[PDB]
Amino acid sequence: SHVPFLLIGGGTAAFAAARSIRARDPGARVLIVSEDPELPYMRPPLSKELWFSDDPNVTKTLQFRQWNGKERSIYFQPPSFYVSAQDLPNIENGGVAVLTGKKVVHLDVRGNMVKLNDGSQITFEKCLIATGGTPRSLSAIDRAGAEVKSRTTLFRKIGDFRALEKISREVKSITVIGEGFLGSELACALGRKSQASGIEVIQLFPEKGNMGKILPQYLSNWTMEKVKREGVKVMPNAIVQSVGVSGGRLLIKLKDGRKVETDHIVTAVGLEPNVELAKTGGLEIDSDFGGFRVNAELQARSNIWVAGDAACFYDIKLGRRRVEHHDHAVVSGRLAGENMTGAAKPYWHQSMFWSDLGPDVGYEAIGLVDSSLPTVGVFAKATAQDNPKSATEQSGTGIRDYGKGVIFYLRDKVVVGIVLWNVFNRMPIARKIIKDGEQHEDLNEVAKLFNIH
Numbered sequence: 001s002h003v004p005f006l007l008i009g010g011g012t013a014a015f016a017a018a019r020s021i022r023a024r025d026p027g028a029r030v031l032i033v034s035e036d037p038e039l040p041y042m043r044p045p046l047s048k049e050l051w052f053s054d055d056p057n058v059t060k061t062l063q064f065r066q067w068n069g070k071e072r073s074i075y076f077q078p079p080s081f082y083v084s085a086q087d088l089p090n091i092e093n094g095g096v097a098v099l100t101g102k103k104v105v106h107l108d109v110r111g112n113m114v115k116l117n118d119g120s121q122i123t124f125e126k127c128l129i130a131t132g133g134t135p136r137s138l139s140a141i142d143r144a145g146a147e148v149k150s151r152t153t154l155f156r157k158i159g160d161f162r163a164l165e166k167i168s169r170e171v172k173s174i175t176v177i178g179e180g181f182l183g184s185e186l187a188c189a190l191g192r193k194s195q196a197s198g199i200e201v202i203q204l205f206p207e208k209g210n211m212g213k214i215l216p217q218y219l220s221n222w223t224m225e226k227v228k229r230e231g232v233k234v235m236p237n238a239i240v241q242s243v244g245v246s247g248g249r250l251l252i253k254l255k256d257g258r259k260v261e262t263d264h265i266v267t268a269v270g271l272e273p274n275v276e277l278a279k280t281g282g283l284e285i286d287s288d289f290g291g292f293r294v295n296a297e298l299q300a301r302s303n304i305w306v307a308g309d310a311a312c313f314y315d316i317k318l319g320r321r322r323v324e325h326h327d328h329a330v331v332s333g334r335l336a337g338e339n340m341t342g343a344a345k346p347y348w349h350q351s352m353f354w355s356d357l358g359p360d361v362g363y364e365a366i367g368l369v370d371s372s373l374p375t376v377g378v379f380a381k382a383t384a385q386d387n388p389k390s391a392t393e394q395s396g397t398g399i400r401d402y403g404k405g406v407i408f409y410l411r412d413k414v415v416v417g418i419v420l421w422n423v424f425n426r427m428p429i430a431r432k433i434i435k436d437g438e439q440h441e442d443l444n445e446v447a448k449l450f451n452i453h
């Protein structure tokens with residue numbers, strides 16, 4: 001068979017593309033192809049809102065409670081929206097179908113055709129690659145035995161949540177490895193769970209403080225203290241020597257002489273993009289940043305675009321980049337869909353990131369953020385509406401004595417990245433400040449733009 005629009009991967013970016021195509025051309029035939037057996041679902045609530053629900057059948061519905069009491073589904077759309085695969089070419093002025101449980105194992109660029117794992121062959125006219133990425137495993141655990149790995153989770157797709165949620169009510173001690181935002185989002189999840197279950201939740205990492213690769217020492221620490229406060233044993237400066245089983249329990253040997261005894265391990269340590277198809281089709285990978293190299297219009301070659309986590313693209317303001325955001329998967333995927341219908345537009349939009357550690361703490365981020373860069377923070381006492389619960393009350397979604405502040409990351413006294421600590425709805429102002437990029441003289445005056453005095 002054949003289809004005029006072929007989206008590889010069933011992701012957040014892959015969906016955003018199909019919506020944007022069918023908006024510009026209301027009769028288009030679109031076929032997503034998913035390795036995953038499940039239909040397009042957003043990822044963020046897997047580590048946050050789905051733990052803070054009181055329905056014990058949430059595991060089955062996947063209907064979450066936002067911080068404002070509202071309900072929502074993890075699935076982007078119901079299965080009524082989508083049409084069937086077999087009847088897509090035939091159904092007249094038809095919609096958008098998806099082919100679950102099938103992996104695209106070869107790309108023939110000059111043939112405008114792909115092969116699937118089962119031997120199938122689909123030709124196409126326009127094609128998107130939106131494969132996302134594979135979770136990294138810890139080199140300590142790679143070396144360890146077979147018995148050791150059977151108690152080690154990675155976190156990404158739903159099954160990983162269902163797995164760990166069951167494990168949560170079964171054992172006494174669970175250890176989270178990684179200082180990243182996901183690592184911490186998960187620690188605070190088990191933390192609230194621990195207030196009733198009385199289990200042991202440990203977060204350990206080689207870094208000095210929580211999110212210490214991005215946040216400056218003052219806030220990185222404050223956050224370490226805030227995560228502790230939520231019922232967690234935080235262990236900074238932990239370099240894992242070796243891991244093994246002994247006496248029905250895992251034992252983590254640290255390089256600094258300490259030893260940890262626990263029942264289960266979750267590894268939250270970054271993302272390896274799925275550039276597996278780059279060989280067979282002969283497309284270019286970026287050796288620095290990783291992923292598929294594409295231009296400012298997200299194009300790899302004639303008839304092939306790439307978006308989401310998997311896309312190393314060219315921002316003209318900031319330079320060549322690659323980002324693993326949700327907002328990015330959405331906006332990039334949407335643009336790529338416009339270009340597949342001829343719009344030939346550049347990626348002028350600046351993607352944004354957010355995180356929530358309970359409904360009492362929240363971070364917003366845009367641009368180039370890094371602890372290594374020189375940093376200026378401006379802080380002030382937080383008020384009643386400065387928290388993610390109170391902000392969700394207002395719009396109520398998934399982002400369409402100091403308590404709050406702003407952090408400028410800079411290079412030549414001109415701002416190139418921004419982090420916001422419990423300051424909400426002021427993202428459009430941060431976007432303006434990066435795009436403009438002037439020689440700001442007093443960053444105290446710039447902070448007044450985020451209501452910081």
Ligand SMILES: Cc1cc2nc3c(=O)[nH]c(=O)nc-3n(C[C@H](O)[C@H](O)[C@H](O)COP(=O)(O)OP(=O)(O)OC[C@H]3O[C@@H](n4cnc5c(N)ncnc54)[C@H](O)[C@@H]3O)c2cc1C
Binds near residue numbers: 157
């Ligand atoms: C727990 C969690 C929490 C997160 N929280 C936040 C947050 O708070 N804020 C934020 O901005 N971002 C967050 N993210 C990031 C966001 O979910 C990702 O950036 C988003 O999933 C990217 O969309 P994507 O389509 O590019 O990748 P994905 O959504 O991973 O989609 C890729 C899909 O394509 C499939 N695929 C891959 N290769 C093939 C192939 N060869 N053939 C067929 N199918 C294939 C994969 O199986 C996968 O299902 C979070 C992610 C996770 C996992």
